[PDB]
Write an enzyme that holds these catalytic residues in place. Structure first.
Site, mmCIF file in Angstrom:
data_model
loop_
_atom_site.group_PDB
_atom_site.id
_atom_site.type_symbol
_atom_site.label_atom_id
_atom_site.label_comp_id
_atom_site.label_asym_id
_atom_site.label_seq_id
_atom_site.Cartn_x
_atom_site.Cartn_y
_atom_site.Cartn_z
ATOM 1 N N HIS A 70 56.388 -16.912 20.501
ATOM 2 C CA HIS A 70 55.549 -17.100 21.668
ATOM 3 C C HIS A 70 56.022 -15.932 22.519
ATOM 4 O O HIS A 70 56.865 -16.087 23.405
ATOM 5 C CB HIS A 70 55.847 -18.423 22.361
ATOM 6 C CG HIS A 70 55.000 -18.665 23.571
ATOM 7 N ND1 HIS A 70 55.241 -18.061 24.786
ATOM 8 C CD2 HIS A 70 53.899 -19.430 23.746
ATOM 9 C CE1 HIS A 70 54.324 -18.443 25.656
ATOM 10 N NE2 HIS A 70 53.497 -19.275 25.050
ATOM 11 N N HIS A 120 46.120 -25.472 20.393
ATOM 12 C CA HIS A 120 46.374 -24.110 20.843
ATOM 13 C C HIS A 120 47.883 -23.908 20.778
ATOM 14 O O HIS A 120 48.642 -24.784 21.199
ATOM 15 C CB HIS A 120 45.868 -23.926 22.278
ATOM 16 C CG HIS A 120 46.384 -22.696 22.954
ATOM 17 N ND1 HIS A 120 47.196 -22.745 24.066
ATOM 18 C CD2 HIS A 120 46.206 -21.383 22.677
ATOM 19 C CE1 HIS A 120 47.493 -21.517 24.447
ATOM 20 N NE2 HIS A 120 46.905 -20.671 23.621
#
Length: 274
Positions: free
Chosen positions: A73, A25
């Site tokens: 991110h 992930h």
């Protein structure tokens, strides 16, 4: 067999949905800018670099990017570019030509169709490494290892909500398509509940053979970091997989993790029949 070439030892006739695949992930969140270091315990999800993960047996990656073609991110730059990622993946597939990689490519800023056009010139450069089918084909059937040898199965996720089409070729498929079953309860679940959802999804995956199951072991919480969840869950999931292997139960789908250990990755691979 070596984790570096574990898929090469599988039958060409085996369907991708009939496998137990280790995945990561937020694959690239193991490095980043100054903001990444300041928010590290909340932002970090891996310790191994992309290349190390592939050699460790990871065959599913989760790449998040923005239209500037850099890896992110959220507002955090991860000190990586899509071109860098593609070159790494491509070099690996060149060295180990029988392996296949499933890649989720997400538009980290869903609100434009510019991302779709921006990534095209880059993807087209590496088209020989992408599993592709005709644009005039809506069968969305999961391929066998024969069709994806040394290739990337792209799972596109963006504003358009449709697969990447370059010319008359459809590159992979859409993330979240009807042929996929996704368990992504990341929003602060209790360890007990999250484990139940993981086990239930793995159970259903073993019974189906015409669908791709993306089973997220990962999660976040205001009071629990990705590192904490993984420390509690990865081992529990590892023992569960070991039991199911004894019971002759295979094809658990894609087990997507944060901070996976070399040991856990190997045991998930061992679930497949060689």
């Amino acid at each position: 067999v070596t984790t570096k070439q574990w898929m090469s030892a599988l039958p060409d006739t085996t369907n991708l949905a009939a496998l137990s695949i280790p995945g990561t992930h937020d694959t690239m969140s193991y490095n980043g800018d100054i903001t990444w270091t300041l928010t590290k315990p909340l932002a970090q999800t891996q310790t191994m670099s992309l290349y190390q993960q592939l050699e460790a047996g990871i065959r599913y990656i989760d790449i998040r990017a923005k239209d500037n073609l850099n890896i992110y991110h959220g507002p955090i730059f991860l000190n990586a570019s899509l071109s860098g990622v593609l070159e790494t993946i491509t070099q690996f597939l060149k060295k180990n030509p029988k392996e296949t990689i499933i890649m989720r490519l997400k538009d980290e800023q869903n609100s434009n169709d510019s991302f779709d056009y921006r990534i095209q010139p880059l993807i087209n450069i590496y088209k020989d490494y992408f599993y592709t089918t005709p644009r005039t084909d809506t069968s969305n059937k999961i391929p066998t290892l024969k069709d994806v040898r040394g290739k990337i199965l792209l799972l596109s996720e963006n504003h358009t909500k449709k697969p990447l089409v370059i010319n008359s070729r459809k590159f992979g498929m859409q993330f979240g398509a009807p042929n996929q079953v996704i368990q992504d309860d990341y929003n602060g679940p209790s360890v007990k509940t999250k484990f139940k959802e993981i086990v239930q999804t793995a159970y259903q995956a073993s019974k189906a053979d015409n669908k791709l199951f993306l089973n997220h072991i990962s999660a976040t919480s205001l009071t629990f970091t990705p590192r904490q969840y993984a420390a509690a869950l990865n081992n529990k999931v590892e023992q569960f997989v070991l039991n199911l292997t004894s019971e002759k139960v295979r094809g658990l789908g894609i087990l997507i993790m944060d901070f996976p250990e070399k040991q856990t990755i190997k045991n998930i691979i061992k679930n497949n029949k060689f």
